[PDB]
Amino acid sequence: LAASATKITADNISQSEAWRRRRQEWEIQKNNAESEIRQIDAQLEALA
Amino acid sequence: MQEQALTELDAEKKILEQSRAGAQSRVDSYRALYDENVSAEEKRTMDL
Amino acid sequence: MQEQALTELDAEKKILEQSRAGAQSRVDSYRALYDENVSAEEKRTMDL
Amino acid sequence: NFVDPTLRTGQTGMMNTMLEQLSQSELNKDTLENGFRQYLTAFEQVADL
């Protein structure tokens, strides 16, 4: 029963780590779109 | 003919403004995903 | 008119520098992901 | 420079099983108090010997 318990808490740590890697991928996608805004704004200034 | 050459750039501005709107929508999506790290219910399942 | 043709390239430089900044941000993200192979807690769950 | 409050040699099983429970991301006061009370229970048991 302690083996089942430590397998459960291992699954808990695995879920939290998967969610943290998910947030890191969201941060990468956020910075991609946020740099693309600055690129499109400089491109609008070049068009002006 | 020069006036048509000048209004084509006013159409190019519409192209780049739609690109700007799409990138702003991606930023507003991923900032909302990144700020809410784990939901109120993803915390409940770690507690469970 | 030639001076406007010359300052448009100084706006194009701003476009490519924002692209350079976005790619540098992606490199700084993925090198940090790649160096930390498994986290300190992803090792704990394998131990568990 | 090289000490780690997480990993120590000779670290007991009580500290390890408390570090298991604090390894999630959401660390509010309730999780971090229940883990400490469970650690203190195990500490009581090894101190009653």
For residue D10, the distance in angstroms to the closest alpha carbon of chain A comes to: 20
3-state secondary structure of D1: coil
**Which residue, A28, A21, B30, B12, is CA-closest to C29?**
A28
D28 alpha carbon, distance to own chain's centre? 15
Task: Read off the DSSP letter of residue D6.
Answer: S
Gap between the Cα atoms of D19 and A7, Å rounded: 15
Resolution of the experimental model, in Å, one decimal:
3.3
Within 8 A of A16 by CB-CB distance, chain B residues are 46
Q: Which of residues 1-49 of D touch B (CB under 8 A)?
A: 24-26, 30-31
Q: Which residue in A20, A32, A46 is closest to C8 by CB distance?
A: A46
3-state secondary structure of B16: helix
Method of determination? cryo-EM
Gap between the Cα atoms of C24 and A46, Å rounded: 23
Q: At residue B13, what are phi and psi to the nearest 5 degrees?
A: -65, -35
